[PDB]
Design a protein around this ligand. Structure first.
Ligand SMILES: Cc1ncc(COP(=O)(O)O)c(C=O)c1O
Ligand SMILES: Cc1ncc(COP(=O)(O)O)c(C=O)c1O
Ligand SMILES: [K+]
Ligand SMILES: [K+]
Lengths: 377, 389
């Protein structure tokens, strides 16, 4: 229970177990509540904009001699897949009687999605963010403030302390399939709607299950959402981690490829550590992939071989960012640009490939243009 | 032909009539071209994201004691209804054999939507934008250049939407052989008003089928913002003479009696602007005046001739809201529904306070999202004073 094979668990201090048991019990009581999931799927349709299209990128398919299809999660409300999980967890907080929503964010994407869902349900919202990340991401900070959320500059530790201090009224929204049980299973079950839509959409366009399904992986929420309905179906599922400046450079975030077994934020999983078990700081041109750990379900999928994993560098992601913008007129998130950049490293000639476009790249345009590799290009 | 009652026509230099007649014939030819409307509707579904949902705004409905539904055009690719028209016209332009696309833009939405359609169809693109708008919309300018389009800031006149159209029209006449002009609203000479409206009426057609599934009858009100009027004509057209009260909201600026607004229908006079006989903000000597609005998308001295016809016959009711009222509705929807609306659409949302809707079914056309307006809203003196509590 709470383990994907040997990975996962609840490796947390004892002061946090009271909240986890309450959440684990409330979530189990809605696993077979059709009124909950119907209300969840109605908001996904009318509020988030689901189902998302499965768009055939003709100009991109002709470039690689393949049939590249893009699952357009960039068209959701707020512009990223994060709204799927944020809506579900705040709905869960509504059933639990919570009146206050809190979360942490580094880039600001999950912070905006959380403040959005909190305003939809009419709850108080407090977003915790590093004081350095606030000064840089002033636009997303003002987005959250416009949505009615209080932004507290300082991270996860301060937010978790808030959760325990005000457990009577406060719910904590985890942004990815990380952390202690039951958060990894909760987020994956709120994100699998991606793969379930793709499973019903790809036969209406090809009459055949896809050959490849590619997605970027940091924490792993968008990949697990599109991979889970395709586990053990013959489709080659490929997760792409953040290679940073290079896997052999120590400036990356490929937790599955270069990490070791460890405990991060309550989860037994692969964590970037040194030889002495000290967690190392990750690095990536995409702030959405700047995480030292990875979801335990992705560690279990790699061990059992049900999903393959590789990585692409920062420069290669910046190329796929410019490529999709000029060839298809879609400005992709720098996160999803890693999954698009992997179209070059595999032979897809005559194959049907589905890429999970996890978000739009409007928020990354300033960072891409100011990058020294793009400036010199 | 080409007129909506007395309004419309082709009041253009004679050298433009050859291009207008060619476009009119090319458009009338694709009327039954099932492959064109299939590829257009297929791109609307898979590339733009249609159909857009009809969202019930529970907290907004509770505040006004009504049943308020939002047509979520903010969820489309590029984030505004402008993508509907940009895809249809650039597709038409590609099939006509053109190789160059130009367009005007105010806030940058039509400029992005055109460059987006130009990149999708692999066509050279040049966007004309008022210099005062380029400095305040640096994000959209860089979006356009990333899509492969050239952005030219117009430095003449008031350096806004109207002057951008002026310079863009001078480009079109100079390069009639290769260049297609994508008009961004239901304005300009025939057949542009009818073309843009027919590409946008999918909004109203989806709404007509969605509202009975949620309420079992037609709504009492449909509200949309009107400057040029393309998003309003798209949602109004299928409901003309249906009994639903259709309300178009113009930009009142600082006030309809301050000389700083863009309410062409309410304060303008009959005139000629960019090839169309319609209502135009003019002085006593018949010279077009400079418009003003907190929203760059509504900053236009003219209005579509179809709206002038609808106002004259009373098929649509027209009114205005001020900059401050639109700013309030912008903040209101953000906090009540978690939706940051375009400042253009915020004029329609502001009109919920002006109608007696206690117990009514109201559909608001949410024509776009307000990410582009964040800085303009927060830096506005009225909002800054509100922030000061
Ligand atoms: C658009 C987008 N995709 C993906 C991610 C990474 O999220 P995850 O790996 O948890 O799905 C982010 C940032 O969190 C993002 O903004
Ligand atoms: C998001 C949005 N909504 C509405 C409008 C109004 O345009 P129109 O009157 O042609 O519908 C614009 C720009 O002008 C816009 O960018
Ligand atoms: K990682
Ligand atoms: K006007």
């Amino acid at each position: 229970k709470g383990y994907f094979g040997p990975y996962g668990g609840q490796y947390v201090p004892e002061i946090l177990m009271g909240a986890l048991e309450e959440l684990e019990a409330a979530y189990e009581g809605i696993m077979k509540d059709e009124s909950f999931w119907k209300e969840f799927n109605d908001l996904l349709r009318d509020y988030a904009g689901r189902p998302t299209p499965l768009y055939f990128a003709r100009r991109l398919s002709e470039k690689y001699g393949a049939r590249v299809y893009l699952k357009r999660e960039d068209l959701l409300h707020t512009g990223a897949h994060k709204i799927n999980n944020a809506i579900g967890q705040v709905l869960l907080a509504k059933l639990m009687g919570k009146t206050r929503i809190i979360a942490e964010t580094g880039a600001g994407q999950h912070g905006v999605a959380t403040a959005t869902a909190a305003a939809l349900f009419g709850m108080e919202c407090v977003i915790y963010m590093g004081e350095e990340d606030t000064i840089r991401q002033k636009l997303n900070v003002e987005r959250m403030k416009l949505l009615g959320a209080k932004v507290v500059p300082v991270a996860i530790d301060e937010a978790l302390r808030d959760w325990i201090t005000n457990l009577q009224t406060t719910y904590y929204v985890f942004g990815s399939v990380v952390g202690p049980h039951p958060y990894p299973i909760i987020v994956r079950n709120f994100q699998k709607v991606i793969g379930e839509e793709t499973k019903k959409q790809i036969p209406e366009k090809e009459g055949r299950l896809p050959d490849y399904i590619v997605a970027c992986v940091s924490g792993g929420s968008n990949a697990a959402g599109i991979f889970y309905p395709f586990i053990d179906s013959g489709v080659k599922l490929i997760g792409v981690e953040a290679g940073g400046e290079g896997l052999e450079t120590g400036k990356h975030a490929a937790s599955l490829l270069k990490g070791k077994i460890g405990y991060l934020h309550g989860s037994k999983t692969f964590v970037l550590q040194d030889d002495w078990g000290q967690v190392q700081v990750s690095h990536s041109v995409s702030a959405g992939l700047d995480y030292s750990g990875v979801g335990p379900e992705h560690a279990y999928w790699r061990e059992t071989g049900k999903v393959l994993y590789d990585a692409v560098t920062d420069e290669e992601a910046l190329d796929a960012f410019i490529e999709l913008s000029r060839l298809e007129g879609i400005i992709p998130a720098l996160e999803s640009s890693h999954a698009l950049a992997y179209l070059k490293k595999i032979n897809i000639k005559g194959k049907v490939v589905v890429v999970n476009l996890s978000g739009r790249g409007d928020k990354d345009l300033e960072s891409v243009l100011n990058h020294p590799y793009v400036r010199e290009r």
